[PDB]
């Protein structure tokens, strides 16, 4: 079941879905979510609202919801592709192979282009994507490239996956989400500086991007850059309140700067204490 923001200021806002799209485009995720939720309220059965909601939620570094809203959308509109994709990435992040692969399998299923065309179930779906990919000789399919890079990640081949993502990115040089999947995949592939450039790109596109601030932080840790890791964690929470996992990371980086007063503030999740810090924000 989905937890809705109670007393939604925008519940009666007429253009709610459309408006949420505007806000989203302008990089405010929290308000975007408010408008999406309001949308769903005005029209419970409206699936696009659920799609964008789930996705946005994922970009909000709240995955738990992203999944519920996504499975909601697919419950209503089982053929929704953006949702199958997103939900696959999310099932990935939370380490469920059966389910990620399920949604990929079905993604292909509902995909008009691809209609025609320990663990070898995963392997089967991977081959499955690879073939159709090959069937597109010249022009590539960023969404297909996506699910494929995912399958590679999930399978463990990081270079392949990265290729898939630069591939997609070639078609959509501006997809902030994809720049994130890249950074995420490099960092996850223990190539951290690379990952950082990717994240920086994403955030240069959608500066409201929670998941990229987070991922970025993780990378900075991996680099031993701490003051910066923290800065990103804070900036994140500041934007998110406008997830505990972010808290967790922060607590860690902090522990590495060995800054005890601050670390205590963090252990308590006392946020404004941390704005400064040193004249931060």
């Amino acid at each position: 079941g989905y937890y809705f923001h109670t007393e939604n200021p925008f519940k009666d806002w007429p253009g709610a879905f459309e408006e949420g799209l505007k806000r989203l485009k302008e990089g405010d995720l929290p308000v975007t979510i408010l408008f999406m939720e309001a949308a769903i309220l005005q029209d419970p059965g409206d699936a696009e609202a659920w799609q964008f909601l789930g996705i946005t939620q994922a970009e909000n570094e709240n995955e738990q919801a992203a999944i519920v809203a996504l499975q909601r959308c697919l419950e209503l509109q089982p053929n929704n592709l953006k949702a199958l994709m997103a939900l696959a990435v999310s099932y990935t992040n939370t380490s469920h192979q059966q389910d990620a692969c399920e949604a990929l399998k079905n993604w292909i299923k509902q995909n008009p282009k691809y209609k025609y065309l320990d663990s070898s179930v995963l392997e089967g779906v991977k081959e499955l994507y690879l073939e159709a990919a090959h069937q597109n000789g010249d022009m590539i399919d960023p969404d297909l490239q996506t699910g494929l890079g995912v399958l590679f990640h999930l399978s463990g081949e990081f270079n392949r996956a990265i290729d898939a993502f630069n591939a997609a990115l070639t078609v959509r040089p501006e997809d902030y989400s994809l720049w994130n999947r890249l950074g995420a995949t490099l960092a996850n592939g223990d190539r951290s500086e690379e990952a950082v450039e990717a994240y920086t790109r994403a955030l240069e596109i959608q500066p409201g991007f929670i998941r990229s601030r987070y991922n970025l932080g993780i990378s900075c840790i991996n680099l031993g850059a701490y003051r910066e890791a923290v800065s990103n964690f804070l900036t994140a929470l500041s934007l998110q309140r406008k997830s505990g996992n972010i808290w967790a990371a922060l607590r860690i980086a902090l522990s590495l700067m060995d800054q005890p007063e601050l670390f205590q503030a963090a252990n308590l999740g006392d946020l404004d204490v941390l704005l400064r810090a040193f004249n931060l924000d």
Binding site: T92, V150, A184, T185, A195, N215
Partner: peptide
């Protein structure tokens, strides 16, 4: 020791 989100 950590994991990045896609």
């Amino acid at each position: 020791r950590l994991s990045s989100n896609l």
